């Protein structure tokens, strides 16, 4: 059966000064998805054809520099993965001699070292997000329009986005995390009360460590879900609200950045939610095998 | 109990399109990226394409970019591969592969593969040419002769020597598929060199798909050209 | 794009081997994402090492993975009969792309090594009368079963019209292979000589036939 964690992609970290969210999965930064989105915008305008060069050079290099940086933390990833496997598995934990409190402190120490690595290696890469943003603003300046900028491309991307929004199963995600968090908090309370009568500390501790990680992943799931829900709601409102045939060149610049930001967050969250949903499914099978070991 | 089953292979005509299938089971298919890998008959593994968990993103290798399309149907747990216009170099085994549980930078489960054979040839019986023993073919007390079975379709062909009388030193090679789309193979026997003038060696070529039975005597090279 | 692997490595049961995999500064050297796959005849390829050094569950400790610069390595300690298979390295190539290596055949030696015997046949008089010309170069009795065949026409290499079969086991557990060079009769007569070049276990042997 399932008793070991094989994937620890769920850990993430955010920047302290500019607050970029870093995922262990490509494209690691949601802003890359925005640069991907600007390719679709740029293919519809004669003036900004030069962005195909910018994306193929600056954007994709940043992507590959980001994946390389994440790879620099594979060692710190395996080090914290080894502690997870030890703390979650009673049979594996009994093979060593340190207390559960000692190894839990090492886990916290190695978890932050790995999370800190993901940020420390990407600091130079994160500095590129700003300069690519401004480079896209100046690129949108070369539009020949002034007060006559047609919004056909703007609302055409919105119509496509409403189709792509329906492909992600939001209702299924919401129903899952509600029943999951419900069951999770019950087992946490059940473990707290049967703990005093059963003299099996190792298995209970293995259950409590799994519940600790489950709590972390539940938080990441809930964070991205309502972020997904927000970008879906805002872009939907844009489809329902006013539909001007033309705007100024600066309103259109804000337009593309706004829907590009909302859509980049939606697919970044969609990437994370698919990963996190696999982590919660996995941790639940582990905690179930542990409960069967405890009661049985 | 994770299983990947490729499908859609076989004999396909050049210049036409082909769609391969990959039936997945034993894991949550809609949650993983998928890859198409192919292996040429004499070459190594070649990475072709990747598609994301929900099928919204597809990427390709430089050697196949613009020639193929990877796609999936997450409601039927199936991965698809579309080759636009088949070439001779598409003759290969195409492997379906699942993104690995430990991370997105490896693949932990592969299928057994399915064979794609590209040829425009009708059924055709082979031409049998003798590989005669000579000075360049003789070393010490051994001599090498054989028959060359060329330009047939489809596989297989059976080769015996003197109606099964010869066995020792006989090696019939696997068939090679040529640029023409026709198979070729050769069978070789090593016999004593002094016995070449007192013995007659014959291959018995049978290509039943064409109802073919050819006997070719293999005599030593007399004189010089 | 291609990662370069040794064609053949070998060792007796119980000792070590090392498969190198040389890449570029854009794949092996740029990421810590090199993979290693084991492949047996008619079996699905099997992942043995991911992320340069890590082993999936069920892969023995004997299989080891490292990397230095643009070259990754795979070390198999204490060889067994099961370890005889083809091994392929794999590395992330950037922008959601991967690149596999040429592939290395590991053979755990059950008999002494044997260099191949090379016999080259010119086109038969029968085939030349049919306005076709095929050169047959037969490679026999070599172990371990891995060979590289080259063709040169008047001392100049020629890759067009070349087909080669993969080594097939003989009855004496040694291997045999064959390579064909298909020509027009005009090409065959317009050259002074042709040559079949057979490299096995680091040594090369040559045979020439001439239309004269």
User: Which of B67, B87, B118 represents a domain boundary (last residue)?
Assistant: B118
What distance in Å separates the CA atoms of residue C76 and residue C87, rounded to the nearest whole number? 11
- Cα(first)–Cα(last) distance of chain B, in Å? 65
A168 touches chain B (CB under 8 A): yes
Under 8 Å CB-to-CB from A143, ≥6 apart: which residues? A45, A47, A48, A149, A249, A252
Burial C45-72 (b: 16+ CB within 10 A, else e): bbbbbbbbbbbbeebeeebbbebeebbb
Which residues of A are less than 8 Å from B104 in CB distance?
9, 25-26
* Residue that the structure tokens 């066995």 belong to: B167
CB A164 to CB B56 under 8 A? yes
Which residues of C are less than 8 Å from B217 in CB distance?
none
The single-letter DSSP state of residue B42 is T
In a domain, B110, yes or no: yes
Contact between C164 and C127 (Cβ < 8 Å): no
Q: Give the SS3 label for residue C101.
A: strand
CB A72 to CB C54 under 8 A? no
Element (H, E) at B4: strand B3-7
Domain ranges (residues) in chain A? 1-296
Provide CATH 2.60.40.10 ranges for chain C.
Answer: 8-108, 117-209
Angle between helical axes of A249-295 and A170-194 (0-180°, round to 10):
40
Q: Is the same domain home to B114 and B133?
A: no
Q: Chain centroid to CA C196: how far?
A: 17
In a domain, B17, yes or no: yes
Q: Is the same domain home to B11 and B114?
A: yes
What distance in Å separates the CA atoms of residue C195 and residue B143, rounded to the nearest whole number? 20
Q: Is the same domain home to B94 and B190?
A: no
Q: Is the same domain home to B213 and B138?
A: yes
Q: What pairs with residue C149 in β-bridges?
A: C198
The single-letter DSSP state of residue A61 is H
Which residues of A are less than 8 Å from C72 in CB distance?
none
In angstroms, the separation between the Cα of residue A80 and the nearest Cα of chain C is 14
Q: Is the same domain home to B60 and B35?
A: yes
In a domain, B80, yes or no: yes
Under 8 Å CB-to-CB from A107, ≥6 apart: which residues? A80, A83, A84, A87, A209
Closest by CA position to C51, among listed A76, B105, B37, A7? B105
User: Which of B87, B118, B149 represents a domain boundary (last residue)?
Assistant: B118
In a domain, B167, yes or no: yes
Bond before A203 cis per omega within 30 degrees: no
Task: Pick A7's closest partner by Cβ from B28, B53, B102.
Answer: B102
Q: Is the same domain home to B110 and B37?
A: yes
Q: Is the same domain home to B8 and B100?
A: yes
Q: What pairs with residue B37 in β-bridges?
A: B47, B95
In angstroms, the separation between the Cα of residue C57 and the nearest Cα of chain A is 9
- Closest residue in B to C166 (Cα) is B42
Q: What pairs with residue A149 in β-bridges?
A: A247
Bond before A27 cis per omega within 30 degrees: yes
Handedness of CA C187, C188, C190, C193 (dihedral sign): positive
In angstroms, the separation between the Cα of residue C58 and the nearest Cα of chain A is 13
Q: Are strands B212-218 and B107-110 parallel, antiparallel or unpaired?
A: unpaired
Q: Give the SS3 label for residue A141.
A: coil
Contact between C36 and C30 (Cβ < 8 Å): no
Output the six-digit token pair for A187.
């087992």
Q: Is the same domain home to B55 and B84?
A: yes
* Residue that the structure tokens 């069920």 belong to: C58
Structure-derived torsion over alpha carbons of residues B173, B179, B181, B184, reported in degrees to the nearest 10: -20
What distance in Å separates the CA atoms of residue A32 and residue A117, rounded to the nearest whole number? 20
Which residues of A are less than 8 Å from C94 in CB distance?
60, 63-64, 67
Domain of residue B42, CATH code:
2.60.40.10
How many domains in chain B?
2
∠ CA B195-B197-B202, rounded to 5°: 85
Q: Is the same domain home to B15 and B112?
A: yes
In B61-169, DSSP assigns E strands to: 68-73, 78-83, 92-99, 107-110, 114-118, 127-131, 138-139, 142-152, 158-161
C202: left (phi over 0), alpha (psi -120 to 50) or beta: left
* Residue that the structure tokens 């829900």 belong to: A229
Q: What pairs with residue C11 in β-bridges?
A: C108
CATH number of the domain located at residue range(s) C8-108 in this protein: 2.60.40.10
SS3 per residue for C146-173:
CCEEEEEECCEECCCCEEECCCEECCCC
What distance in Å separates the CA atoms of residue C65 and residue C86, rounded to the nearest whole number? 16
B42 touches chain C (CB under 8 A): yes
Q: Give the SS3 label for residue C65.
A: strand
Q: Is the same domain home to B154 and B60?
A: no
Q: Is the same domain home to B134 and B83?
A: no
* Residue that the structure tokens 């090199």 belong to: C34
∠ CA A56-A31-B60, rounded to 5°: 40
CB A7 to CB B104 under 8 A? no
Output the six-digit token pair for C124.
């038969």
Angle between helical axes of A201-240 and A170-194 (0-180°, round to 10):
160
B193: left (phi over 0), alpha (psi -120 to 50) or beta: alpha
What distance in Å separates the CA atoms of residue C21 and residue C102, rounded to the nearest whole number? 9
Under 8 Å CB-to-CB from A219, ≥6 apart: which residues? none
CB A67 to CB C31 under 8 A? yes
Cα–Cα distances in Å, from C94 out to A67, B23, B132, C47, C91? 8, 28, 54, 20, 9
Closest by CA position to B103, among listed B52, B30, B3, B32? B32
A130: left (phi over 0), alpha (psi -120 to 50) or beta: alpha
In a domain, B144, yes or no: yes
- Cα(first)–Cα(last) distance of chain C, in Å? 42
* Residue that the structure tokens 């409960």 belong to: A291
Which range marks the domain in which residue B97 is found? Answer: 3-118
Chain C residues 12-71 with a CB less than 8 Å from chain A:
30-33, 51-54, 57
Which residues of B are less than 8 Å from C96 in CB distance?
50, 57, 59
Q: Is the same domain home to B97 and B43?
A: yes
What distance in Å separates the CA atoms of residue B196 and residue B215, rounded to the nearest whole number? 18
Q: Give the SS3 label for residue B131.
A: strand
C92 touches chain B (CB under 8 A): yes
- Residue A3 sits at φ, ψ, to 5 deg, of -145, 5
Architecture of domain C117-209 in CATH? Sandwich (2.60)
Angle between helical axes of A201-240 and A74-88 (0-180°, round to 10):
130
Q: Are strands C17-22 and C34-39 parallel, antiparallel or unpaired?
A: unpaired
In angstroms, the separation between the Cα of residue B129 and the nearest Cα of chain C is 6
In a domain, B49, yes or no: yes
Best of B173, B189, B191 to disrupt the C interface (most C CBs within 10 Å) is B173
Contact between C45 and B93 (Cβ < 8 Å): no
């Amino acid at each position: 059966s399932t008793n070991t964690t094989d994937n620890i992609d769920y850990f993430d970290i955010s920047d302290e000064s500019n607050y970029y969210l870093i995922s262990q999965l490509r494209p690691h930064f949601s802003n890359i998805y925005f640069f991907d989105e600007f390719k679709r915008y740029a293919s519809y305008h004669t003036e900004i054809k030069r962005y195909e060069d910018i994306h193929k050079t600056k954007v994709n290099s940043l992507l590959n520099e980001a994946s390389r940086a994440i790879g620099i933390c594979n060692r710190a990833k395996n080090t914290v993965k080894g502690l997870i496997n030890i703390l979650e598995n009673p049979q594996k934990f009994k093979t060593q001699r340190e207390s559960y409190d000692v190894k839990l402190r090492q886990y916290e120490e190695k978890k932050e070292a790995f999370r800190g690595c993901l940020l420390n290696k990407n600091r130079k890469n994160l500095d590129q997000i700003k300069k690519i943003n401004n480079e896209i603003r100046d690129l949108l300046e070369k539009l020949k329009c002034s007060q006559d900028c047609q919004t056909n491309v703007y609302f055409d991307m919105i119509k496509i986005y409403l189709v792509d929004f329906k492909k992600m199963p939001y209702e299924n995600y919401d129903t899952f995390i509600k029943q999951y968090k419900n069951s999770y908090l019950s087992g946490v309370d059940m473990i707290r009360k049967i703990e005093k009568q059963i003299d099996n500390p190792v298995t209970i501790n293995a259950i409590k460590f799994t519940q600790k990680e489950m709590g972390y992943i539940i938080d990441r799931f809930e964070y991205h879900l309502q972020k997904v829900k927000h970008s879906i709601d805002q872009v939907t409102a844009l489809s329902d609200g006013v539909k001007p045939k033309q705007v100024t060149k600066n309103r259109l610049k804000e337009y593309y950045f706004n829907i590009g930001n909302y859509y980049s967050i939606f697919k970044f969250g969609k990437d994370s939610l698919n990963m996190l949903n696999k982590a919660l499914i996995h941790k639940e099978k582990i905690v179930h095998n542990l409960l069967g070991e405890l009661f049985g | 109990q994770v299983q990947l089953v490729e499908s859609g292979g076989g004999v396909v005509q050049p210049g036409r399109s082909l769609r391969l299938s990959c039936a997945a089971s034993g894991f949550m298919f809609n949650s993983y990226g998928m890859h198409w890998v192919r292996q040429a008959p004499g070459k190594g593994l070649e990475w072709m394409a990747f598609i994301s968990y929900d099928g919204s993103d597809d990427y390709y290798g430089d050697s196949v970019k613009g020639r193929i399309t990877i796609s999936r149907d997450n409601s039927k747990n199936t991965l698809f591969l579309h080759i636009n216009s088949l070439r001779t170099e598409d003759t290969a085994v195409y492997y379906c592969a699942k993104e690995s549980n430990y991370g997105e930078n490896a693949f932990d489960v592969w299928g057994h593969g399915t064979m794609v054979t590209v040829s425009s040839a009708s059924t055709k019986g082979p031409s049998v040419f003798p590989l005669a023993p000579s000075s360049k073919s003789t070393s010490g007390g051994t001599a090498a002769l054989g028959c060359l079975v060329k330009d047939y379709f489809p596989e297989p062909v059976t080769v015996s020597w003197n109606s099964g009388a010869l066995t020792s030193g006989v090696h019939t090679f696997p068939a090679v598929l040529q640029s023409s789309g026709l198979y070729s193979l050769s069978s070789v026997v090593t016999v004593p060199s002094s016995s070449l003038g007192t013995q007659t060696y014959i291959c018995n070529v049978n290509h039943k798909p064409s109802n073919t039975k050819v006997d070719k005597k293999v005599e030593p090279k007399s004189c010089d050209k | 794009s291609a990662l370069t692997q040794p064609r053949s490595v070998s060792g007796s049961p119980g000792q070590s081997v090392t498969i190198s995999c040389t890449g570029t500064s854009n794949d092996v050297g740029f990421y810590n994402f090199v993979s290693w796959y084991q492949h047996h005849p008619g079996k699905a390829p099997k992942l043995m090492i991911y992320d340069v050094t890590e082993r999936p569950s069920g892969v023995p400790d004997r299989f080891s993975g490292s990397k230095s610069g643009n070259t990754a390595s795979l070390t198999i300690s204490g060889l067994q009969a099961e370890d005889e298979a083809e091994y392929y390295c794999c590395s992330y190539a950037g922008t959601y792309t991967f690149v596999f290596g040429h592939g290395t055949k590991v053979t755990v030696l059950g008999q002494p090594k044997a260099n191949p015997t090379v016999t080259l046949f010119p086109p038969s008089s029968e085939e030349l009368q049919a306005n076709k010309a095929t050169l047959v170069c037969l490679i026999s009795d070599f172990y371990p079963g891995a060979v590289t065949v080259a063709w040169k026409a008047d001392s100049s290499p020629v890759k067009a019209g070349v087909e080669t079969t993969t080594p097939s086991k003989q009855s004496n557990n040694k291997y045999a292979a064959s390579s064909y060079l298909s020509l027009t009769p005009e090409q065959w007569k317009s050259h002074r000589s042709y040559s079949c070049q057979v490299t096995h276990e680091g040594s090369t042997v040559e045979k020439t036939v001439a239309p004269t």
